[PDB]
Amino acid sequence: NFALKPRMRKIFSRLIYIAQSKGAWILTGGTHYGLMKYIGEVVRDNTISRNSEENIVAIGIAAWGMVSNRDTLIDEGHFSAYILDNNHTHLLLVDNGCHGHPTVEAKLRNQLEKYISERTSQDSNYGGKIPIVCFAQGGGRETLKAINTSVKSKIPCVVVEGSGQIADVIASLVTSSMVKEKLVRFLPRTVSRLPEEEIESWIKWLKEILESSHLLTVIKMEEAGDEIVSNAI
């Protein structure tokens, strides 16, 4: 579940407008639940409002172990009732073993990011190289693992907001003690369900985050007018 306040609503509407103006791929999870619902909604709306001039490309990358109804074909399927989202125009589902396995798609996702980041396409203004931006807004282990796999790789261009769960704990501080102090002050109801043997691991994750502060940027609260997403990216 996800809270859709009109500020983040405006930000992601502006984001999908920028992705239509530039002709960009948007990589995402692709399930029916939460933010990807709203991304599929705004993709469908910008598709239905113009119906031409570079119809946009959204790739959902899922795990295949959380999908309830699965059809093995060669023959189009009819998926109905994690549930996949209706409006993502491309889907890729990674093959692995049993059902209850989160964090499977992240390896192929980050390797695809790395390959397009080293892919050369000279018909641009970036000196080729197809520039790549990662966005984080919310919370979870998947967010932090994705940000560190990005910033470990070249061209991460990690952008966060000033509202969320981990976007607040990264936005506020830009050693171990201050990481502990922020993580207990912005997440009150998550620390109780966590052993400290991986909380120190999270401290190591965030210390690997803050190594390259030139590869990370933030959207602030005073900066709340129009075209702030372009001014960030």
Partner: protein
């Protein structure tokens, strides 16, 4: 003299009021003439009675997806209009 030149004054005042509304009332009345001359399948006039016999021929014998597409189109400018209202 008095009673006719009073009528002149009242006519002048009524023309002074109703003129900025007169164009609106005329182009509101335009709907009815367009919808009586665009409704029927009408040939020119003195032959129309022959076509009336064609309707006698009638008495001699006798969810939609693009709608949802254009309503979904309408919703986008509704959202843009609400954005504009709150932008003012």
């Amino acid at each position: 003299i008095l009673l006719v030149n009073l009528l002149v004054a009242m006519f002048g005042y009524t023309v002074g009021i109703v003129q900025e509304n007169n164009d609106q009332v005329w182009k509101f009345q335009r709907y009815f003439l367009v919808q009586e001359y665009c409704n029927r399948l009408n040939i020119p006039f003195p032959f129309v009675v022959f076509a009336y016999f064609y309707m006698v021929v009638k008495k001699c014998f006798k969810f939609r997806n693009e709608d949802n597409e254009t309503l979904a189109w309408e919703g986008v400018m509704k959202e843009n209009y609400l954005v504009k209202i709150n932008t003012k």
